[PDB]
Structure formats: C-alpha cells, structure tokens
Write a protein that binds this DNA or RNA. Structure first.
Length: 231
DNA sequence: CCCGAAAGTCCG
DNA sequence: CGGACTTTCGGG
C-alpha cells in the first residue's frame, strides 16, 4: 500500500528545496546519526504550511499513520515535520496515545525528537492523568533505554507549581548514578527549571543528595547567585 | 530586538 | 572537569 499522498507531497516539496551544503553541518550537529536535507526550521515550517494549504490537513483517522510514515523516512527534517504535524492534532491526543508516543521516543531517538515529545505531549497527558504516571515511569526508569529514562526525568519540565516534588526527587534518585551524558544533563535541566519556581527546595536537594557533577552545576547555574559560593 | 535553552566545539 | 564560546530555536 502506497505512502499517504500528504506524506508523498511533503517529501516531494521538501526534497525540491534541499540544501546539501547546509545538510552537512546540520548532520554533524547531530553526530551524524541522521541524514539531513539541509532545511532549517523557518523554511521547513513554511514548506509544511504550503502542503497543508494545497492538500488540507489529513482527516484525524490518518494522524498516527502520517506520523509513522514520516518517522520512517531517512532525513531528519521529516521527523521534525512529523512533530509539527502532531501539534496540529493536539486536541485529539489523550492518555490512550501514551504507547504511541513511547514508540516515537524509542525510534530514531536523539535529544531533538525526545525533547520535542516529552515535556509537551507527554507532559500534558500526565498533568491531566497523574494516576497514570505509575503505570509508565517505573518501567521507563528500569528500561535499558536512556531516552525513556530522559522522558521520566523531563515530562514534568514545564509543570512549575504543579510539579510533584516527591516524585521528581524520587526519579532523580533512581537515575543520579547514571554515567550517561543525556541523563546527567536532563537531571540538571529539570532541577534548573524547577529552581525558577522553588529555588530553596532545589538548593537544599543538591546540597544534600548525590548528583553527577554536571547535574549539580547545571542545576544551580542561576540560583548559586542567590545563595553564594562558599570558600 | 532581547534572553535562555537544547545541544555543539575548543581550551586549560 | 568546567568555563568560554558557536549556535538555532522558542518565547517574551
């Protein structure tokens, strides 16, 4: 069965505007894990907009199908476009889509896709259905997959006052010994971000609990100004 | 415009 | 390590 015509149209239109010269450093920026067409975000969004203006957005019944097909295409701009498109179907996404989102996190995985999926899409779902957190987070933490572990750390990134502190610190405690850069950095990020809401709690945490040096210094990047740096 | 963030390199 | 910088993107 052929590619969805929307996807085919997107693929034709992107490919006609490819830039091999830009593609090389863009691919190097992602450690050469992916082929790139060499289209940066402002143009990529306009090209998508063009295809929607002509073909209209596919019926929601094809939403997951479109995302999968784009996900399977080799160049990274198609996963970036897939995430743009998924945003346009946001009001159709609910708790039943968590396994679908899991699957996106663990395929073609890198910080660009996972960071675009987790604090927004998964974050919003677990905010509305916090009782579902325990059906997924422990599995993610225990998995061999560092991107699921990073998802467990970052899904609360934007929660601000809705942050479950006990949960956040429990998750960090489970992952604080990881030697993985993307885990240490995620821990640093989520603490740095939460410190913008509750600096005292983050400060007390990092001064009294083991963290990778990277995690700690990223966490207190800003709030160290408020407490000072002891001799 | 600005700032802060993911990364990234380069250097001691 | 960790700081200083390159850098694209999102969000005032």
């Amino acid at each position: 069965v052929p590619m969805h015509p929307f996807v085919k149209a997107l693929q034709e239109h992107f490919t006609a505007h490819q830039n091999p010269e830009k593609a090389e450093p863009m691919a190097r920026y992602m450690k050469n894990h992916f082929l790139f067409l060499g289209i940066q975000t402002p143009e990529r969004r306009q090209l998508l907009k063009d295809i929607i203006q002509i073909h209209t957005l596919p019926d929601q019944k094809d939403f997951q199908i479109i995302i999968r097909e784009l996900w399977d295409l080799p160049e990274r701009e198609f996963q970036a476009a897939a995430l743009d498109i998924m945003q346009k179907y946001k009001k159709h996404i609910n708790e039943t889509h968590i396994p679908f989102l899991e699957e996106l996190i663990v395929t073609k995985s890198w910080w660009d896709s996972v960071d675009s999926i987790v604090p927004t899409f998964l974050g919003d779902i677990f905010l509305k259905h916090p009782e579902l957190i325990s059906a997924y987070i422990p599995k993610w933490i225990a998995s061999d997959n560092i991107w699921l572990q990073r998802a467990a750390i970052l899904f609360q990134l934007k929660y601000k006052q809705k942050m479950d502190e006990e949960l956040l610190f429990w998750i960090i405690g489970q992952l604080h010994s990881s030697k993985e850069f993307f885990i240490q950095k995620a821990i640093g990020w989520v603490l740095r971000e939460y410190a913008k809401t509750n600096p005292d709690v983050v400060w007390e945490y990092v001064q009294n609990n083991e963290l990778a040096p990277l995690s700690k210094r990223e966490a207190i990047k800003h709030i160290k100004q408020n407490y000072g740096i002891n001799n």
